[PDB]
Amino acid sequence: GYRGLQTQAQSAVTAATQMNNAWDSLTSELETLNANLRKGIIDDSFLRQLFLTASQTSVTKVLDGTKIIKQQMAGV
Amino acid sequence: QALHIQTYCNSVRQQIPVDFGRFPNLRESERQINTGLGAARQHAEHYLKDIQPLIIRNVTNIQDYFETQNLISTVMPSGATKEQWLSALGMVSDKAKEYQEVSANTRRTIGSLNDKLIIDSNNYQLIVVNLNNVVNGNNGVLEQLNRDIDGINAAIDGAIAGIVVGGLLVIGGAIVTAIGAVAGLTSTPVVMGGIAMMTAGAGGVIGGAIVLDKSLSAREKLYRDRSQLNSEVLVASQIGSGYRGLQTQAQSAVTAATQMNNAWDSLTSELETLNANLRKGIIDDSFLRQLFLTASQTSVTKVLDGTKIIKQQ
Amino acid sequence: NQSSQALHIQTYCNSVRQQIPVDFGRFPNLRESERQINTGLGAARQHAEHYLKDIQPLIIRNVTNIQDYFETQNLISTVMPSGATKEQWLSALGMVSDKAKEYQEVSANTRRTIGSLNDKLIIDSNNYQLIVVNLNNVVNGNNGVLEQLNRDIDGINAAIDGAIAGIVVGGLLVIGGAIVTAIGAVAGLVTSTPVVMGGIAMMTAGAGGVIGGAIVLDKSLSAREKLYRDRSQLNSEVLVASQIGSGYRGLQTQAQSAVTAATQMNNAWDSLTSELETLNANLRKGIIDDSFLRQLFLTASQTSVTKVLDGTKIIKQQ
Amino acid sequence: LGAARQHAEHYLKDIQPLIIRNVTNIQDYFETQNLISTVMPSGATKEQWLSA
Amino acid sequence: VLEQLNRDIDGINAAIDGAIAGIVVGGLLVIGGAIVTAIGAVAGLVTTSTPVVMGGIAMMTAGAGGVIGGAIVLDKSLSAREKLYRDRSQLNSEVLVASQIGS
Amino acid sequence: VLEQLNRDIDGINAAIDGAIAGIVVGGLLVIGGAIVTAIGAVAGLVTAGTSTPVVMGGIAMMTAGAGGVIGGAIVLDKSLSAREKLYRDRSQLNSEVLVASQIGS
């Protein structure tokens, strides 16, 4: 049982490390957009349609995944 | 989740106290079981009389609060001062903080319930193992008894044989003695042999009866012990099945409780996000204020969902 | 009730992660089995982490980009659309053609990823099966030994009873000898020396039998004990093997299903890649076409576009 | 066993893929075949139909 | 190889039974020897019963020797039979696997 | 066929045990013979005359023990070698039947 608990923690460590890399990537991606913006490389016209298209897809798909995980813990 | 625990609670209440007083080896088992059952009962009464009701209250208050919390005026509603909007937001922020604290309180209650159930299930399992061991030992004894009972019937038949052989010897001796007597006219040796056969027949019948009465009387003691052990094992297997069923009920209730803990934890986090979204909007002047206020409006939907979710749990 | 291909693999992945390493340290015959199992389990874990942390996410990304692309380019304008130069239409088509080419290359890339995943899963399932067979062999050998033990244990109880018999017979002989000796002695105090001798002899023999039997019994149970210990040890080892074996068997099934799920995903991407190539071919032949033959290839490409949009929805479901 | 594995990988990675391509090509072909009269209006030439 | 294994496996359990036999026969021989030795000894105190005592002591000695020798063989044998059986099963599995890949 | 084989295999183990018995009985006879011979020899080194018959009986017991051990070994090697042929046929028939039951299904 203790051995199994040790494995559960080892896996949770990997899961957490993964989450750390994900946030780190998002932080870096934001910095790149900021740098792209500041230099005049993009426009607040085009970057709006970019985030709006992601919201139409990816962002909505993540928001759903969040509500789903919230239920999976509750059993609701 | 709640109904599943509510059912398991009333069910445990119906768990009757046992006296294995007839079984000397189950003395510790009975007391241990009785104590554990008593403790579980205490856990249930608390859960029923306080916990579930208190949880319902906090959720209801939260439900009413979010109900009032209309669509968020990220900019400021029509014909109001900036101070008026700030005051209303500050009031809402304060109320949310209180609600957040209440949510944390409910979680703690759930945590205690979880621990109580966990302890109950564990104690149940311990009783089951203790019982399983008793019947798994008692069934070694049972085999040695059946083997001894088989060995005892042999002596029982050996006595039955001696008793019959004696009866025949006497019967034959009488016929011989009578013949030998009529042939005396001498025929004294025939009469002697007939009397001897009669005498020996009586001796064998007497000796066998003594052995038989004693042999069945050893056999009786062994059979009594076998039956007593069989009954004790059955009783253990009876209470054992019941405890096993109770252990499952608790294991399920643990999952139900853990689920409720995660639900409250989510609501608490969602409130903290709305609070953070709110706070940063009060110390923001123009566009960044409307940004945090819109995010808080999304917070508000996330909390309203968490409410409906907890209500279902 | 049925799961999507990805969820089936996602479940199998997290499940393999939970696979604990075992030590058959007590079992001398399972030494190689344990190490082999441990190694294979370790490798499978590596396959899962990759699948979970990289593969499934990368696949999702490529599909999403494809979904967004086809969304923008929903239907091919076979005819010269309203108020445009022929060059303007040609440029737009050429741009679409170039984008499709890039998307085709991306599709081939995803397929390669799937291929690697397939191989990784295949290797995992194979190693699992190998452990199962290795285990099955151990319990199927160990159960020959178990029978010889039960047969020997049966043969041992006979000597155990034979000693018990000698001990009792000795006790009776001594008891009877004492009664006879006492009788013979009282008859010698009237004028019966042979009776006393026979009584003393019966007593002597009774003691000898009780002593000899005790020596044999203590030794016989002590041979019986060694045999029983081995029997129990083998029984436990076999049970342990049958325990881990059931688990490995379940893991093997999980991998076999994941293999089917992966193969399905490979076929899906292959279809999307082919559908893109057809649209590209339909496009290319329309740029180097006169009036009517151009609209013909452009309409076929519009049908291509629907076939790709379907392939997208299909992959999304996988 | 190694050689047999090679045979399978080829069958799976290349045969199965080529078979899949065939269906797509067929799909594209029949797509155009319908598109023939779909484009060719009322009063197209016999030569125009023959060329297509 | 499989035939040499089955022949060796037969020779392994054979010695195992041969020890089991000697241990039982040994226990009886000793038991009988003790009864005989005791009889022979009481007849030597009672006038020319030395040969009976010798035969009884010999039976006892042989009985003990068989019980001891069997125990030594058994303790040594038990580890060896398991190894042979394991190899037999492994070979059986390997042959099946080979027959499987062919099919 | 399979039943006649199991019945014959049962009949074969009896001779196999009968050889195992002769081998052990021989080992004991030799062991006892050695103890007797040694006793008879030490009694001949005080009363040369009259402890020669004991030594003879001890040597005879040893000789007979060896004879039984040798005879049994010959029988055993042959008996298992008849048993082995029967077992091989049984396994072959079992496999054939299984294969038939496989294709049959």
Author numbering:
A (entry chain EEE): 272 to 347
B (entry chain FFF): 27 to 211, 216 to 343
C (entry chain DDD): 22, 24 to 213, 217 to 343
D (entry chain CCC): 63 to 114
E (entry chain CCC): 167 to 213, 216 to 271
F (entry chain JJJ): 167 to 271
Tell me what the authors wrote about this structure, in their words:
Like the AhlB pore, the SmhB pore contained ten monomers of SmhB in two conformations (type 1 and type 2) which assemble into a ring with pseudo tenfold symmetry. Although the resolution of this structure was low, the electron density was clear and continuous for the protein chain, enabling a model to be built with residues truncated at Cβ. In addition, clear positive difference density could be observed in omit maps calculated with sections of the model deleted (residues 157–251 in chain A and B), indicating that the structure solution was correct. As seen in AhlB, the head domain of SmhB undergoes a large scale conformational change transforming from the soluble to pore forms, with the β-tongue substructure refolding to form extended hydrophobic helices to α3 and α4. The transformation from a soluble β-tongue containing structure to an extended helical pore structure seen in SmhB and modelled in SmhA, occurs in a similar way for A. hydrophila AhlB7. In order for this conformational change to occur, the C-terminal loop and helix α7 must move to free the β-tongue to form the two extended trans-membrane helices in the pore conformation (α3-α4), with the N-terminal helix (α1) also moving from parallel to α7 to an end to end packing, resulting in a narrower more compact tail. As the overall structures of the soluble and pore forms of SmhB are almost identical to those of AhlB (RMSD Cα 0.64 Å and 0.46 Å, respectively),, not surprising given the high level of sequence identity (62%), we investigated if these structural similarities also conveyed functional similarities. Haemolytic assays, replacing the SmhB component of the SmhABC pore with AhlB in a 1:1:1 ratio showed that this chimeric pore had the same lytic activity as the SmhABC pore.
Tripartite α-PFTs are members of the ClyA α-PFT family. Proteins in this family undergo a large scale conformational change from a compact soluble structure, where the hydrophobic residues are hidden often within a β-tongue motif, to an extended pore structure with the hydrophobic residues exposed in two extended α-helices which insert into the cell membrane. Here we show that S. marcescens has a tripartite haemolytic α-PFT (SmhABC), and propose a mechanism of pore assembly. We present the structures of the soluble A component (SmhA), as well as the soluble and pore conformations of the B component (SmhB).
